[PDB]
Each structure stands twice: as structure tokens, then as C-alpha cells.
Design a protein around this nucleic acid. Structure first.
Lengths: 263, 169, 276, 488, 182
RNA sequence: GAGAACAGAAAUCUCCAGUAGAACAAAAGGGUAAAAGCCCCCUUGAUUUUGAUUUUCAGUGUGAAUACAAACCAUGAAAGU
RNA sequence: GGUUGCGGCCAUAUCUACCAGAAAGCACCGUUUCCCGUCCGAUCAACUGUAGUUAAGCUGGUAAGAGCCUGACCGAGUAGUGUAGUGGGUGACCAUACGCGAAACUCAGGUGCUGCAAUCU
């Protein structure tokens, strides 16, 4: 009676939200190199994640209804579709939804010089912490495509929001870097995805407070090439970017004490 | 070859189904109790039947399982009653076997006119060492082909110790 | 008979799962500490009980498939001077008293940390696949760790000597099990009643000619010795890597070619077909 | 749960700005430094660039020529230890540590059941933290194995309650004071009655203090001293089992007794009077101290932590012979004793006039200073091990820190809700445990003058605590019957 | 060993999500895919930003509680967790805001005659004979005495009440559907 | 499907199978498999206290409903839920 | 390399029928006083490493096996289809062009890879 209520309570809307649940779908044309990169990318987004076994016939820019059909079933806003072709080799298509309706799409085609967690020297880690971030580029701020890519990966990989954070949790960092500066007119450069684990050292010139940080690679090394991009409608931005809504000459003091200025 | 893959008895399971529930049920229970030392168990009816006059969950039948020496005693003691003569059936393809007797007095045991007569189902289930594999919780497995109990191997075992006769085609 | 279509159809459980030792449902709950309230690293004392043997293991949690900080074992106890009763509860408690010292010793607090200080190492205990019951030897090992000063949250309950029909514990009964004096008492019973069974059981001890009352005192001494030298030592070994490999491959069957298989069929259709 | 109230709409936008960093700009201004000891000596002027406080040890150690590390302070207005110079020449105040770290005691081990009554007292062994005796309102005392959390010989003998207990500083003998009339000496290992019980006092026994080691001859056992409610004090010899001399100066009951440094008993009593008592005169009074308007509860000495342990320092590594034990007992004494190269033992008292007077009985029968502060009665007093801070427990739910040398007020510890019964120190002189009429015990960081960690556990009143000398372990005991042990 | 990192342009931070936005000018042929010495430049560039991200985080305020031993959903004493701010960075939300505000007919009426909605204490009504308390709705209801009990006074009386309950239960579950619609 | 006296088309016991013609509150579409199915043990719930909703005539430092959060309660060896 | 314990991927790891295993380690195995749970020491519980045994489990090998997976100008630039033309045709629907572009089918290869710690002629 009151089991599958609690499904619908979680799947209903909520002021302080849950984690956006990831869904990695193999498309029709998936292959073992991509199926690795899927899992290497998923291993960061653990736990809040699902994979299929099957190879599904989807064509995002032709027909959207299967993606909403999957999203509404599983209750998963973040979707990643895996396609491959001679035009678009290793095509990872990133999708987000807003109330089980399509918010945006962006196609990231993976370069041939990727490297996986098996390849690098294997080092200490914990399952499903908060990552740190670095975004190297002014284009991330200014340019709307790279604003959308900035809007993706933070929303993807952050996991749970929180007011309050441990030291020992701060183990690793995602690095996004755009491949050089560019002018409008030119081809759009690649986006380099690198993943580093930290190592502290006792620095002297800092002292007790500030350490020396030393990064070490673990991967997965990915280099993304931009494809077709479906942008949101300007009303749906106004809906999506909306606060929950939940004083003049009136201040709380310390001790509570609701004080009022006379003036 | 055989060292130690011998042919021990897993268990004897005695059973008395009762058409009715009441005195005559709890008395059948009492028979299995004093015979086994152990308290017996009351199976319920699985559905309502009508031509048997029984309803779902009625409590219909008692039984008891017995393992190690006491098993073999009651086996042989009942085995006597059947003249040391079973049948070519009676043995299962997976190498167990069973028989019945009517009248629970034909194997020790007095009568008591405030108790009545029942008879019994005897069923003797056989194994080798390492049957545990298909029975323990941890590393649970299935037993390989040339370790499984068979009809041939159990009948041969029966024909030997006990000395009894098989009968039939 | 199986329908070939069905054999395709069914989806296998997790390979490791399918194996009886390890359970995937339980793991999920241990996969995330909460993890919503805060971000914290996780340490777990994985305990399994193997025949003729005691094993205690402590495992980091990692998308690699994990790393071990400390390793505690029954064969260590002979080095600490206890040969006897590895399966026994008493012996398990010593493993707990010992594991904790080595990790502390390597960790270096006695004998990125900023804004203070030593910090208290908190390890959530592993279930294993073992059933939970009071006076379990699994929970004996937990109590051992507490002497070590490891914190898992626990009850006095699942120790032996726990009264069901009141929320109370006897420390004397728990004290006996640590020593293995209860097991020693059973030896006394065997000495007074029979000696057919006495020869069969504790036969090694009898070769030693140690006595049950004395064994309790001997057990007491061993606990003290563990604290003195908990660092651990590794055995020097006879025979290299390569030899062990070579001798093993004498009895390890080896692959074939398609070419060899092609002959075997051709050979087969020569024999078993063409009119005998 | 009434909350700490939330941050306002502006106070968020304060936090959202990037700010500060630790930095240290370079830092090299040439500011002049003076060096001063807290004992007496000033030692004269250097003028370096700015450096970390680990390095200012290495500047001192070569100058004095030691390798002794040192703790530092400055601005004595203020009193507070580049880390100084951000608050704006510097008079640097150096002082020795005794180098250590005893840990903050956080976790309970689970509650040890046993005897079915309230627990009245609870003393650790000096030499090891495994051994710990408890005296209950059940007629049994009990010795606990504390590593295994279980009873090592459940101990019987008496036919009333057992009010105080004490472990001898050599660590051979336990002594148990009683609500009847008797004392019973015990061996830890056997747990058996060493002869007949010591009988002599007419009413119940109030406290028991041992003759410390450095007085006693190498190859003789230490004598006991016992105060009782009739008001006499007797001095018990352990071998012969008979008192040498009764001492009967006090009219009313004696609240506690202590055996001092230089052959000198001190006895805090209910006739408002503190009697300094020489051993060599064979039962005779020398000086009689009068301040208090009420009776005197408890009497702490500067040496008392050293006299209690007697030779066994924190490792507990034993003396090989009595002639070694003489020297080890003398050396632990002479760590604290020679402060200015002179054996100035401080004595301090508590009483229901809400006041502690500070005494130096060899030098003057006058008092030095009047520590006055509390509202309701003070109950326990304690010097810190190094004789540097004093602290006293009170019935107004608050523990006041007083400087040991001049009896000057420092600070107050606030946190306890109901009345505080007794306190004890960590050996390194940093942490400080306290027990209350409510459930909770708390531990107090003396350096920052603050609550380090609250620890709840018990179901009822908690009378007794003690800290183990090594400083792994803390005991407790009270009205709910269950002995709880506490650790890191 | 040197910790602090100058740049030409100031770094724009987000300590809610833990991010460091860097607008300083990158070289092409450093990060071109033909380059042998490519990756160490990305490591060198990132290590600066991560250092600058940490050197903020350690200068935040931190919670330092005195509670210990089973703080049943929180931190121990000798942790010390760092008080982060909120996100500056505006995400898009997962779902639209939970506001399906209907009045539903009763509450319209309950405005016009108020009917301040009630103090709402609990289940247990008092029985007289029995002496004991006994609810109401819950268990052994003051609803279902008449069904169980043994004589009635003044066609069956009980099953009329079993009807006349289920009329009112139907009526509530009907009167939902109009207010669910509107 | 293969066996066991009375015992039969349906009485209970025993061995091997249904990737689920298990029943998962529901409706489907997926996957849980040492389960959410069946059986046993342990137990309140319409809790109390404060910022957003709205309603009062003693505007009742909120009096009570409602939205959320926090202490608490239940259970378990705990992880937790 | 073998083996135990923990695993990551989660069928190249499973399923069916046979075959082999030196060492150690798993394992089966013996016993019911103690704590514990059962209709039943079979499960679970404890005690011993003794009396025995590689017979299973486990790990490899075997087979034009049953499945699954990868690769391809094998099928195929095929169907599907955006866009363009006052293209065709009575309609149903289908060529031309500028762009993307599947799956069965058919042939070829493979039959688990690997993180951490201890221990073996």
C-alpha cells in the first residue's frame, strides 16, 4: 500500500532537490572502445547512475520521444546516448530534461587519443565523493556553446549539494580546458577533459596552514569535439531558472531578537 | 574408484496424512513423537477440495525427520514388517526409496484402545559425503554427474547390507 | 531439455555475485556512507572464517576495487606464541587486539591533517555472509578490536553470556571466552570422563603436555606479547617466483590450434562414417 | 532543539566574496625580541626577521646550549601567544613543556556491570592503565582489568560500605577505607586478606594517603596514613599491622589527610583548622592554620600527582632495584620541586565559605592569597601536575582556573548544568576532566580555556572519576552501578 | 615549496560547487595534439588553479562541535568541517516548482464562514462503560460498536449502517474528483 | 516430470526443473534475486518547536491548521533504512 | 604462474557432456560439553586440525557443441529520410539532386581480462 507511494514521493517535485540521476544508454551503433569510455565516465558519477544492456535505436535530432519515454520511466534527467559513425566517430550525445521534456542537446565526439583507467598507474580514490573543478577559458564565461558545456559538467558531476564539507573528501579534481584561444569566424576548438588526484606536502613557505599541492594523473583522458547543438527556448529558461521563494528596517540580532530600526 | 564417496543415509522421513483434524490427528502426532523423541510438524491443506472435505489451511497431516543411528533402527524395524521384500519400482531415479506399513503395532509398540490404529509412510533419502555443497549457505553449488546417487547404485547397496530382496521385473 | 532460445534469453547474475561468497544487495548500502550529509573516506574490517584458519581483513572502498591498509592472520599467532585453537572464539579476540596495534603503529599516532589533530580512526564493521547470533566468533573478533581501541558501534548482546529475558551482560562470562578457559573446562571434563575422546581431541596440546588451567594463563601472556611487537614481519621464503611457476606448469594442460582440431574431425569422418 | 539562528541575506553575500588567504607577505621586518622565563630570569636583545615558532626553539636551544623544547607567549593587557604580529616590541615569554601529547578522551567502551549498588570511589593503578580498583556501596570492592573490560578478582572482606580507596605508589598494596571502622590491605595479584584487618579508628574512614617513596628507605615498604570521622589520625605500618602513634589535635571530623614532601602531614578538618604535622616528633603538632569561617573540605598539594604515582613515569617501565626506585622517585619529584632551585611546596584548601586560601606552611603560617569567586561551596581542589595552575570544583556548576604561584584568577569553565563533585588532570597539563550531579562528564582544554568535548553515557549521578597516568584511559563511577571506561 | 601563485588576471571562484574559472590567455601550439610536451603544461596550468582553489577553502570558517558518541545525524568532536557558501552558479532545475494550488470548495466555504480549522489533538475518544479509553478511528472504533455488539432495538439494523458508512466513504471519494478536476 | 502402504482426477512427504505462465499496493516498461513474494521476532505516530502560507476581534512574543527544516521515536551487531 | 580473501568490468566470465589436478591453500570431513538454533547438529551454532580424501565443489583442458562478443568496401552506399525543381502520374506512390545513413543476412577471429594483500616444490 505505502511502498509505491514512496516511489512517487521521490519522483514528485521538491524544494530542496535530489541528485540528478544519470542514465547511460548504448545506442544502435555502440562499440567496445566506447563501452569502456561509458564505464570510465560512469565510475565518477557513481552511485547516481544507470546502464542498459541493450542496443537501442534512437536518433536524437530526428525523433525525441523515446528519450522522454526513458526519462519519465526511470526518473533520470541527465541522459547520455552512445552513437558511432564514419562521420561522427565515438559520438557521445549529452541530454538534459526539465519535467520529462527536452531542455537541450549537445554532441561530443571523442578523439582517437583517449586513455583509460587501466592504462595509467592506479592510485587511491573513494566511491562517489564531491569532485573539485577547474575550467580553463574565458570562452566558458562568454561564448554560449561553452556556457552550455560549463552548464553541463557542473550539473553532471557535482552530485549532492551541501552547506558544509570535510577536508579528507577533497581528493580529486576535474579539469576542463578549451584547446587554445580563438576568434569568431573560425572552427570551434576541442575541449580537453583531464582528471587529477591531489597530493599534499608540508611546504614551509606556506607553513602549517597552506600546503603544497602536487597533482597526479589517473584518467580517464578524453578530448571532445563539438557537433550539432540544440538550445533551450527563452520561456523554458525563465521557468527552469526560477527560485522556490522559500523585512525593511527589520533585522535578526544574535540571540534571535527581532530588532527594528526607528530612524 | 571408491574410498569415501560411500553411500550414507541422509534421512528417514516418517509421514501420516489425516483426512480429519482432531483427536485422531493429535494422536497420530503423539505416535510420531514417542517413536522419534522429536516433536512432529503439522502441514496445512494447500487448497480446498470438497470431495475430501477439507479447506485451505486446515492442518491436515503430521510428519517427522530422523537422522543417524535412531534412523537406521526404525528403518530396519519397519523394513522387517515388509518381509525384507520391496519392488523394482519403490526406488527413485535419483537414488532414494520408500515403503509403507499399515498397522503401527507390527514393529514393537503396544496398542492402547483409547488411541486406535494408524499406519505410516517410510521414505529413505540417500547421499554421499559432499552433498552439503547443494545445501550449505556459502559457496553453494551443484553436485557433479559421477558423484550423484542413482537407482542402480542404491539398489546394489540395499541388496547388500540388510540382505533384502528386490522383486518384480 | 533446454530450449536454445531460452538459454540466450536469460540474463546472468553478477559474476562475483553468482559466486556464493559475495552479495551485491548488501554492498550498495556500504557503497555510500550516507553520503548526502558529508564526504568522508570509508574503512571496513572484512572478516571471513576458513577451515583450520583465522583471517581478519580491512579494506578501503574504491572504484578500482579497493586497497587494504592492514592484514591480520592466524599464522601470525604462532609467531606470537599461540599454536592452538584457531577456530576458537578466544583466538579471534586476539586477532582484534592486534590488527588495531599494527594500523595505529603504521599510522604513527602512538609509539592532510590540518586544524588539528591526531583524529579518531572509525571503521564500520563488515557483515560478511555469516548469520548473526549471540556468542558468535565473528563478534568475538569485534570485541578484540575494541581492546585495540577501534570503534565500531556495537551491543553487548551478540557476545556470549547475554541474558535474553533481561538487558544485562556478565563480564566474567565474556572474560572466560577471551582466555578460552571455557574450552579448557571442557578439557577437564574429558580428562575426568573417558580418555578415548581425549586422545582424539587436543592431541597436539597433549604432545606439548600443556594443562587447561595453565593454558588460560598462557593465553593471558600472549595478549601482552602482541602489544609489545605489533609491527609484523614477512617470511623470507624458499624457492623463487620462477620455480613455483615452472613446477606448476608441469601439471597445467595447454591449448590447441584450429589446425589440430581440423585433423581430429577429418580423422573422425574417416573412422566413424565410411562403413566402419 | 533551540538553534543557533541563521545567516542573514547580507551575511551570505559577505561569505560569497573571495577573501584573505594566509599569505605571510614575506615576512622580513627587523623587529627586536626580548627573552624572559616565567620562573625569574630575563635573557638580552636580538633583532631577526620574522619566522615560524618551531624555529625560535632552535634559536634558543643553541644559545642556552641544551641539545628541551619550549612553549611561547607574548603581550603581558591581552595575554595571548608573525601570529602575534598580525594583531598589531615583543617581550617573548618562554616556558618548558615536559614534551608529550595526551589525547582528547572521546569514546566510551561499553558499560561494565558488576556489584549492585552505587560506586563511591575509583582509583587507577600507578604503574599500568590495565589495573584499576573501585569501592562501592555494596560491601565488595572490585579490581577491573581495563584492557579487556572485565573483573580481575571480585574482592570481599568488609561488612559495611567502602568509601575511599588508594593504590600504594610502589604498587604492591591496595588500601580500602570503610563505613564501619576498619582498613583492609590487599595484594592485587592474589586478592587475599593480608592478615587481620586494621582496626583502631572508632568511626568511619574519610581518606587514605600513603607515605611517598623518596622519604622511605630503599628496601622498606611505605606506611599508610588514615583519617577518620572521630577526628584522630593513625599511621599504619603494613608489615607489623599496628599503628605507631595516634594523633589527636582536631576536635571535629577530619575531611581529608595528605602526606607531604618533607616529612609533613597536612589534615583538613571540620574545626575550621589546618594542622601541619611533623613525623619526626613522633605524633606532634608544629603549626595550626586558621582562616576559614566554615569547615574545610579537601586539601591539595603542589606535589600530590608526583607523590601519588611515586617513581612510575608515563611509560611505566619498572625500577630494577629499590636503590633505583629511590632515584626515580626523587627525579620525578625534582622535576616539579626545584622551580627556582628551592623546595617550595604550595598547599591549598576548599571550604563552605566559598573561598580557597593559599598556604606555604614552612615559610609562613600566614596565607599568601585569597581565591574568592564562587557563589556556593567549593568541594574538590586540584593542582595541575607541574604545580602551575590550580583548579577547583564547586556546587554552582562552574569550575574556576587559578594561577598556582600567586593564587591569581585566570578564567572559568562553563558548561555543567548541575553541581560539580570532583576533577582530575591529564599528566601533560593540557586536558582536564570533570564530573557532575547530572549524567555528563566533560573534558576541558586548559590552554584555550574551553570545552573540548562533552561525553554522555551514564543513567544517573556520577560521583567519582580518575585519569590514567599514561593518559589513554579515564574511569568513572556513580549511582547507576555501571563502571564506564573512556578513551580516544 | 613555494605555495602562492600570481596571475595576470584575477580568478573568479565558486566555492559552493568548488570551482575556479580562469580567463587567462592560452597558447595554441602548447595544447596542439601533435605536441610531445603537451600534458605537463595542462598539469602545470591546473595545479595553479587547484592550489588557488584550496587556498580559498582553507581560509573559510569551520564548525567545531563539542558533541560526541552517536551524534545521530552529524559530526564528531574532532572532525572540523569547513563552512562553504551557497552556489553563485545558476543551474537549471530538475523539475518545475510544486504549486498545484486549488482551493477545493470546502476551503472556499471555510473562508466565508470561518471555521478556524481545528486544534486536532489525537485519535482516542473516551468510552463510558467501558472504563478504558479506546478510539474512534484506528482500532475497535466508536464507529464499529454497533456492528460487533449484541442487541440493537428497532430488515436488519447493522447492515443499514454498513451501507450508510460506505455512502459517506463513496461521497468523499466522489467529492475528491471534482476538486481534482478543478 | 519421477517415486512412497491405506491413498483414488485432487490428502502429505522427497528429488529435479519454471530467469520468472514468482507477485512485486497499483498500470505498464525495465530490473531487483539471500526480494518488495511467503514465514518468524521487535515496536509509536494525529511528536514538539521555529522561519515561509492564511484567519482572529483582546494580534491572543503566536492561538491553531498548512509548507519545510531540526531534535526525537522505531529497528538492526552495525552500515543504515 | 598456481591458490585463498576482497573486488572492478559484470556471458570472450554462463550452460550441456566428458577428462586432469605435484605442492600448499580452499574444501569435504569428525564431535555435541560450552554460547546458539532447529520437526531434525541437514542448514545455523560451537569444539578439533586429530581419524580420512581428491569422490565432488573449485580451477584449468576438451567439443566443425548450445549461446554471447568483436571486425568488415559480407549485405549496402540498400531501406529510411532532411532539403530542392510549375519533376512524372487520373490516383496509389516513385525517379532526378545536395546531404546523412541502419539491422537481419554472410564470412572471419575469440572463449574471461585485471586492482590490493598474504602464502606455496
Amino acid at each position: 500500500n505505502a511502498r509505491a507511494k514512496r516511489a512517487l514521493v521521490k519522483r514528485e517535485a521538491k524544494l530542496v532537490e535530489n541528485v540528478k540521476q544519470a542514465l547511460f544508454i548504448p545506442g544502435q551503433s555502440c562499440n567496445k572502445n566506447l563501452h569502456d569510455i561509458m564505464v570510465d565516465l560512469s565510475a565518477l558519477k557513481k552511485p547516481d547512475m544507470k546502464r542498459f544492456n541493450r542496443k537501442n535505436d534512437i536518433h536524437p535530432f530526428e525523433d525525441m520521444s523515446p528519450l522522454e519515454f526513458f526519462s519519465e520511466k526511470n526518473d533520470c534527467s541527465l541522459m547520455v546516448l552512445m552513437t558511432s559513425s564514419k562521420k561522427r566517430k565515438n559520438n557521445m550525445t549529452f541530454i538534459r530534461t526539465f519535467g520529462y521534456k527536452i531542455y537541450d542537446m549537445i554532441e561530443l565526439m571523442v578523439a582517437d587519443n583517449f586513455k583509460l583507467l587501466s592504462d595509467f598507474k592506479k592510485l587511491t580514490f573513494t566511491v562517489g565523493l564531491k569532485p573539485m573543478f577547474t575550467f580553463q577559458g574565458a570562452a566558458f564565461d562568454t561564448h554560449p556553446v561553452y556556457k552550455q558545456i560549463k552548464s553541463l559538467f557542473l550539473d553532471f558531476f557535482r552530485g549532492e549539494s551541501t552547506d558544509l564539507q570535510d577536508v579528507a573528501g577533497l581528493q580529486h579534481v576535474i579539469s576542463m580546458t578549451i584547446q587554445g584561444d580563438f576568434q569568431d569566424g573560425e572552427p570551434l576548438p576541442n575541449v580537453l577533459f583531464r582528471v587529477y588526484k591531489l597530493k599534499s606536502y608540508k611546504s614551509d613557505q606556506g607553513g602549517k596552514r597552506l600546503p603544497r599541492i602536487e597533482l597526479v594523473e589517473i584518467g580517464p583522458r578524453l578530448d571532445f569535439k563539438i557537433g550539432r547543438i540544440h538550445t533551450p527556448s527563452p520561456d523554458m529558461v525563465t521557468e527552469a531558472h526560477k527560485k522556490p521563494k522559500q523585512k525593511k528596517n527589520v533585522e535578526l540580532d544574535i540571540m534571535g531578537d527581532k530588532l527594528g530600526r526607528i530612524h | 574408484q571408491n574410498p569415501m564417496r560411500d553411500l550414507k543415509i541422509e534421512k528417514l522421513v516418517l509421514n501420516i496424512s489425516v483426512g480429519e483434524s482432531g483427536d485422531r490427528l493429535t494422536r497420530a502426532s503423539k505416535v510420531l513423537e514417542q517413536l522419534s523423541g522429536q516433536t512432529p510438524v503439522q502441514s496445512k491443506a494447500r487448497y480446498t477440495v470438497r470431495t475430501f472435505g477439507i479447506r485451505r489451511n486446515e492442518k491436515i497431516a503430521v510428519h517427522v525427520t530422523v537422522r543417524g543411528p535412531k534412523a537406521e533402527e526404525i528403518l530396519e524395524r519397519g523394513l522387517k514388517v515388509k518381509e525384507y521384500q520391496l519392488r523394482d519400482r519403490n526406488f527413485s531415479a535419483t537414488g532414494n526409496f520408500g515403503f509403507g506399513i499399515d498397522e503401527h503395532i507390527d514393529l514393537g509398540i503396544k496398542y492402547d484402545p483409547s488411541i486406535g490404529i494408524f499406519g505410516m509412510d517410510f521414505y529413505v533419502v540417500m547421499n554421499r559425503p559432499g552433498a552439503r555443497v547443494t545445501r550449505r549457505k556459502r559457496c553453494k553449488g551443484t553436485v557433479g554427474n559421477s558423484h550423484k546417487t542413482t537407482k542402480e547404485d542404491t539398489v546394489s547397496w540395499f541388496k547388500q547390507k540388510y540382505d533384502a530382496d528386490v522383486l518384480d521385473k | 531439455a533446454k530450449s536454445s532460445a531460452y538459454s540466450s534469453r536469460f540474463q546472468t547474475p553478477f559474476r562475483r555475485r553468482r559466486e556464493g561468497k559475495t552479495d551485491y544487495y548488501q554492498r550498495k548500502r556500504l557503497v555510500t556512507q550516507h553520503k548526502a550529509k558529508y564526504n568522508t573516506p570509508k574503512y571496513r574490517l572484512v572478516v571471513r572464517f576458513t577451515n583450520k584458519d583465522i583471517i581478519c581483513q580491512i579494506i578501503s572502498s574504491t572504484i578500482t576495487g579497493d586497497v587494504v591498509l592492514a592484514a591480520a592472520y592466524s599464522h601470525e599467532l604462532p609467531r606470537y606464541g599461540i599454536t592452538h585453537g584457531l577456530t576458537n572464539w578466544a583466538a579471534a579476540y586476539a586477532t582484534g587486539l592486534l590488527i588495531a596495534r599494527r594500523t595505529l603503529q603504521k599510522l604513527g599516532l602512538d609509539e592532510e591533517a590540518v586544524e588539528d589533530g591526531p583524529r579518531p580512526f572509525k571503521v564500520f564493521l563488515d557483515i560478511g555472509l555469516q548469520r548473526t547470533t549471540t556468542g558468535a566468533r565473528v563478534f568475538g573478533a569485534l570485541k578484540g578490536a575494541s581492546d585495540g581501541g577501534l570503534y565500531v558501534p556495537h551491543s553487548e548482546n551478540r557476545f556470549p553470556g547475554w541474558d535474553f529475558e533481561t538487558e544485562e551482560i556478565d563480564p566474567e562470562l565474556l572474560r572466560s571466552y577471551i582466555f578460552g578457559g571455557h574450552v579448557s573446562q571442557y578439557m577437564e571434563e574429558l580428562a575426568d570422563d573417558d580418555e578415548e575422546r581425549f586422545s582424539e581431541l587436543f592431541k597436539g596440546y597433549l604432545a606439548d603436555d600443556i594443562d587447561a588451567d595453565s593454558l588460560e594463563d598462557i593465553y593471558t601472556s600472549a595478549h601482552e606479547a602482541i602489544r609489545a611487537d605489533p609491527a609484523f614481519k614477512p617470511t623470507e621464503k624458499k624457492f623463487t617466483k620462477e620455480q613455483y611457476a615452472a613446477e606448476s606448469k608441469k601439471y597445467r594442460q595447454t591449448k590447441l590450434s584450429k589446425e589440430e582440431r581440423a585433423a581430429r574431425v577429418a580423422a573422425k569422418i574417416a573412422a566413424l562414417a565410411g562403413q566402419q | 532543539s533551540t538553534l543557533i539562528p541563521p545567516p542573514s541575506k547580507k551575511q551570505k553575500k559577505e561569505a560569497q566574496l573571495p577573501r584573505e588567504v594566509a599569505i605571510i607577505p614575506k615576512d622580513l621586518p627587523n623587529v627586536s625580541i626580548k627573552f624572559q622565563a616565567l620562573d625569574t630570569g630575563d635573557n638580552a636583545l636580538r633583532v631577526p626577521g620574522a619566522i615560524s615558532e618551531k624555529q625560535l626553539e632552535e634559536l634558543l636551544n643553541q644559545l642556552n646550549g641544551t641539545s628541551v623544547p619550549y612553549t611561547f607567549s607574548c603581550t603581558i593587557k591581552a595575554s595571548d601567544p608573525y601570529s602575534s604580529l598580525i594583531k598589531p616590541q615583543i617581550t617573548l615569554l618562554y616556558t618548558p613543556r615536559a614534551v608529550f601529547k595526551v589525547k582528547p578522551v572521546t569514546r566510551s567502551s561499553s558499560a561494565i556491570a558488576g556489584h549492585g549498588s552505587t560506586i563511591l570511589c575509583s582509583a587507577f593503578a600507578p604503574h599500568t592503565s590495565s589495573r584499576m580498583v573501585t569501592g562501592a556501596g555494596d560491601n565488595t570492592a572490585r579490581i577491573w582489568d581495563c584492557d579487556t573490560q572485565t573483573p580481575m578478582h571480585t574482592l570481599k572482606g568488609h561488612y559495611n560500605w567502602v568509601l575511599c580507596v588508594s593504590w600504594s605508589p610502589d604498587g604492591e598494596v591496595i588500601a580500602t577505607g570503610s563505613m564501619d571502622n576498619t582498613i583492609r590491605l590487599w595484594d592485587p595479584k592474589s586478592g587475599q586478606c593480608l592478615g587481620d584487618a586494621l582496626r583502631g579508628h572508632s568511626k568511619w574512614i574519610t581518606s587514605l594517603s600513603w607515605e611517598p617513596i623518596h622519604l622511605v628507605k630503599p628496601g622498606s615498604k611505605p606506611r599508610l596514613a588514615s583519617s577518620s570521622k572521630d577526628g584522630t589520625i593513625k599511621i599504619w605500618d603494613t608489615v607489623s599491622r599496628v599503628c605507631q602513634y595516634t594523633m589527636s589535635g582536631h576536635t571535629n571530623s577530619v575531611s581529608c589527610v595528605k602526606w607531604g614532601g618533607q616529612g609533613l602531614l597536612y589534615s583538613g578538618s571540620h574545626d575550621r583548622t589546618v594542622r601541619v604535622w611533623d613525623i619526626n616528633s613522633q605524633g606532634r603538632c608544629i603549626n595550626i592554620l586558621k582562616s576559614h569561617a566554615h569547615w574545610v573540605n579537601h586539601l591539595s598539594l603542589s606535589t600530590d600527582y608526583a607523590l601519588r604515582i611515586g617513581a612510575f613515569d608515563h611509560t611505566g617501565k619498572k625500577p630494577s632495584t629499590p636503590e633505583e626506585a629511590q632515584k626515580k622517585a626523587l627525579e620525578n619529584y625534582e622535576k616539579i620541586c626545584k622551580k627556582n632551585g628551592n623546595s617550595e611546596e604550595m598547599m591549598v584548601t576548599a571550604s563552605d565559605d566559598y573561598t580557597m586560601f593559599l598556604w606555604n606552611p614552612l615559610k609562613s603560617t600566614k596565607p599568601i592569597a585569597r581565591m574568592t569567586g564562587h557563589q556556593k561551596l567549593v568541594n574538590h581542589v586540584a593542582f595541575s601536575p607541574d604545580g602551575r595552575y590550580i583548579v577547583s570544583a564547586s556546587f554552582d556548576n562552574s569550575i574556576k582556573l587559578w594561577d598556582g604561584r600567586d593564587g591569581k584568577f585566570i578564567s572559568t569553565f562553563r558548561g555543567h548544568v548541575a553541581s560539580v563533585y570532583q576533577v582530575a588532570w591529564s599528566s601533560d597539563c593540557r586536558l582536564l576532566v570533570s564530573c557532575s550531579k547530572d549524567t555528563t562528564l566533560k573534558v576541558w582544554d586548559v590552554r584555550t580555556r574551553k570545552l573540548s568535548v562533552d561525553l554522555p553515557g551514564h543513567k544517573d549521578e556520577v560521583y567519582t572519576v580518575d585519569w590514567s597516568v599514561d593518559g589513554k584511559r579515564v574511569c568513572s563511577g556513580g549511582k547507576d552501578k555501571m563502571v564506564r571506561l573512556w578513551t580516544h | 615549496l613555494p605555495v602562492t601563485v600570481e596571475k595576470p588576471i584575477p580568478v573568479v571562484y565558486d566555492l559552493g560547487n568548488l570551482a575556479a574559472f580562469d580567463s587567462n590567455v592560452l597558447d595554441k601550439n602548447d595544447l596542439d595534439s601533435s605536441n610531445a610536451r603537451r600534458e605537463e603544461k595542462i598539469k602545470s596550468l591546473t595545479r595553479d588553479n587547484v592550489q588557488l582553489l584550496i587556498n580559498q577553502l582553507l581560509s573559510l570558517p569551520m564548525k567545531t562541535t563539542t558533541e560526541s558518541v552517536g551524534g545521530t545525524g552529524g559530526q564528531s568532536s574532532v572532525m572540523t568541517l569547513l563552512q562553504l557558501p551557497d552556489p553563485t552558479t545558476d543551474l537549471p532545475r530538475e523539475k518545475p516548482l510544486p504549486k498545484a494550488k486549488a482551493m477545493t470548495k470546502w476551503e472556499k466555504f471555510a473562508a466565508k464562514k470561518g471555521i478556524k480549522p481545528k486544534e486536532r489533538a489525537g485519535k482516542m475518544i473516551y468510552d463510558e462503560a467501558s472504563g478504558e479509553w479506546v478510539p474512534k478511528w484506528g482500532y475497535k472504533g466508536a464507529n464499529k460498536k454497533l456492528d460487533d455488539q449484541w442487541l440493537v432495538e428497532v430488515i436488519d439494523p447493522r447492515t443499514l449502517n454498513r451501507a450508510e458508512r460506505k455512502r459517506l466513504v463513496k461521497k468523499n471519494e466522489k467529492q475528491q474528483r471534482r476538486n481534482m478536476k478543478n
